[PDB]
Every structure is written in C-alpha cells, then in structure tokens.
C-alpha cells in the first residue's frame, strides 16, 4: 500500500557519451497502476550535449500497469526497491551500458543512474542528432536465475523515414527476495513532449502496460 495511486520521483544521472561527460537531474510524476508518467530533466553539467537526447530517454519500471494475474515484480520490491543493468547495442556499433538503483524515500521514488555510451560513429545519427524519437516497443520479460530479464529490439525514427535499431538486454533485480512472474510483455510508448532549443531542458511522457504473451 506504499505505492500510492499517484507517485512522484526524483532522478540523478551521470554519463559519458563518446568521451563527453555530463550530469542530469530531474523529477517526474505519474500513476503507477494506470501505467503512465511524465518527467522533466535538465542538464546540470557538461551541456549542451553534443548527441541525440533519444539515447538517454529510455534511461521507471514502478509505473507499469500490470494485469491482476501477473505479479508486479517492480512494485513488490518496494520499499527496498530494485536495481537494473542494461546493454543497448546499436546496429552501427554504438554501445550504451547502464546501472541503476531505484528506491523509495519519503514517499517518493528515488532513481540513480550511471551510464556510458561508446563508439557512436561521428557521421551516425546519434552524433549527427538525426533521430526523431522511439517507436513503441515490446519488452519481453522472463525469469532467469532469480532475476527478471527483459529483451527489446528498439527502433529510433530517422528523419528520412528509416529506422535505427538497438538490441537491448536488461537484468532487473529486487533488493529483497520477491516472487517472480512468468514470462510476459511490457508494451511501452515514450515521447518527448517539449525541450528547449539545445535540449538542456526536456520533458518526456511514457505509458507502459504489462500483458501476456498469447
């Protein structure tokens, strides 16, 4: 009963992408049982970023709407919370790795993110900043070795109508022993709703719902 119908969060990220260091702070809010949230981020160090915002945007699992019959691993993990680690392999060789800790403090989610991005080609759409947001995704979740894993083949939209693809694996682990669901899918749609000219301030909006795999 600790995850309320309406919850806020605070986040801090530090990252290095192609050698460029930076820090981001943000806050957000949403409805964890209805499966939606918004966030407002600001680049507090090392901005403007010389690369697409979209590689950062998918870097808040407590807010996925779960059917009654699929255990909500993310919510059951609280108040302790959970960690996750992720690799995102972009098709042109760019790699993003991420570690993250989510906890609950004073009735607010606290997220802490560290990430590194390497090998984004100088001429590619990330460094060229030619992406236009992610298409909707289906994250395949499944229990493996006392943790919960998610795989996603994700696609960033390109200006010219093409797509730029990243193969994503994430391991989710509760900080306390918690019951695992069976395999299932989280449908997710994230959009950037507004930003200043140089993406030093960005607002984004995500909806996510668990569902069975037929």
User: 212 a known binding residue?
Assistant: yes
User: 66 a known binding residue?
Assistant: no
Closest CA to 183 of 206, 210, 155, 208: 210
Degrees to nearest 5, angle at CA 138 with 27 and 186: 60
User: 151 a known binding residue?
Assistant: yes
User: Quick one: tokens of 105?
Assistant: 């403090």
User: 191 a known binding residue?
Assistant: no
User: 20 a known binding residue?
Assistant: no
Closest CA to 131 of 205, 198, 20, 51: 51
User: 85 a known binding residue?
Assistant: no
**Cis preceding linkage at 79, omega within 30:** yes
Closest CA to 91 of 17, 163, 20, 171: 163
Residue with tokens 């959970």: 82
Residue 154: C-alpha distances to residues 47, 81, 106, 188 (Å)? 26, 26, 34, 10
Backbone φ and ψ of 190, nearest 5°: -115, 135
In Å, the largest CA–CA distance within the chain is 50
Name the binding residues for Zn(2+): 69, 135, 144-145, 151, 163, 195, 212
Name the binding residues: 69, 135, 144-145, 151, 163, 195, 212
């Amino acid at each position: 009963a600790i995850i309320k119908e309406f919850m806020r969060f605070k986040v801090r990220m530090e990252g290095t992408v192609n050698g460029h260091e930076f820090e981001i702070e943000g806050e957000g809010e949403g409805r964890p049982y209805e499966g939606f949230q918004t966030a407002k981020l600001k680049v507090t160090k090392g901005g403007p970023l010389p690369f697409a915002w979209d590689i950062l945007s998918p870097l808040s699992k407590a807010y996925v709407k779960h059917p009654a019959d699929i255990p909500d691993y993310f919510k059951l993990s609280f108040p302790e919370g959970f960690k996750w680690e992720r690799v995102m392999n972009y098709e042109d060789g760019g790699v993003v790795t991420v570690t993250q800790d989510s906890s609950l403090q004073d009735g607010e989610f606290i997220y802490k993110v560290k990430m590194r991005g390497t090998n984004f080609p100088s001429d590619g759409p990330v460094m060229q900043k030619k992406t236009m947001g992610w298409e909707a995704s289906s994250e395949r979740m499944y229990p493996e070795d006392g943790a919960l894993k998610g795989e996603i083949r994700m696609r960033l939209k390109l200006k010219d109508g093409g797509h730029y693809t990243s193969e994503v694996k994430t391991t989710y682990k509760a900080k306390k022993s918690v019951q695992l669901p069976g395999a299932y899918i989280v449908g997710i749609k994230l959009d950037i709703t507004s930003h200043n000219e140089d993406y030093t301030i960005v607002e984004q909006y995500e909806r996510a719902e668990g569902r069975h795999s037929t």
